Design a binder for this molecule. Sequence first.
Ligand SMILES: *[C@@H]1O[C@H](CO)[C@@H](O[C@@H]2O[C@H](CO)[C@@H](O)[C@H](O)[C@H]2NC(C)=O)[C@H](O)[C@H]1NC(C)=O
Ligand SMILES: *[C@@H]1O[C@H](CO)[C@@H](O)[C@H](O)[C@H]1NC(C)=O
Ligand SMILES: *[C@@H]1O[C@H](CO)[C@@H](O)[C@H](O)[C@H]1NC(C)=O
Lengths: 43, 42
Amino acid sequence: PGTNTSNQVAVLYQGVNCTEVPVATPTWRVYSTGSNVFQTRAG
Amino acid sequence: DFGGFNFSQILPDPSKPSKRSFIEDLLFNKVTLADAGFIKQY
Ligand SMILES: *[C@@H]1O[C@H](CO)[C@@H](O[C@@H]2O[C@H](CO)[C@@H](O)[C@H](O)[C@H]2NC(C)=O)[C@H](O)[C@H]1NC(C)=O
Ligand SMILES: *[C@@H]1O[C@H](CO)[C@@H](O)[C@H](O)[C@H]1NC(C)=O
Ligand SMILES: *[C@@H]1O[C@H](CO)[C@@H](O)[C@H](O)[C@H]1NC(C)=O
């Protein structure tokens, strides 16, 4: 939402089933905790 | 009550899951695409 408003961000994995992230280049994996993973048609 | 004018074929059809008119459904059947990113599941 912009750096000045907040440093919180959301990550979208395009064209990926949400189970394939637990199945799984990016070193950071701090979002694998989930508990708010949403499966959209975009990803 | 549109003065005898009949718009049923261009007005939405509530029965269908997509509220498309008869002519809109005809057009969508007429045109065949090749994918639009319908969440590929591999
Ligand atoms: C407006 O036009 C549609 C057809 O384009 C009419 O719907 C038809 O109505 C008769 C009898 O009710 C049915 O036998 C047909 O099967 C209907 N066609 C379709 C596609 O549903 C409709 O009756 C017309 N509206 C008015 C007020 O006359
Ligand atoms: C938003 O960013 C601008 C930088 O142009 C800054 O002036 C402003 O203070 C920021 N808003 C907040 C609440 O920090
Ligand atoms: C993703 O995975 C599960 C099982 O692997 C499947 O049921 C689901 O339909 C898939 N998601 C989508 C949006 O197709």
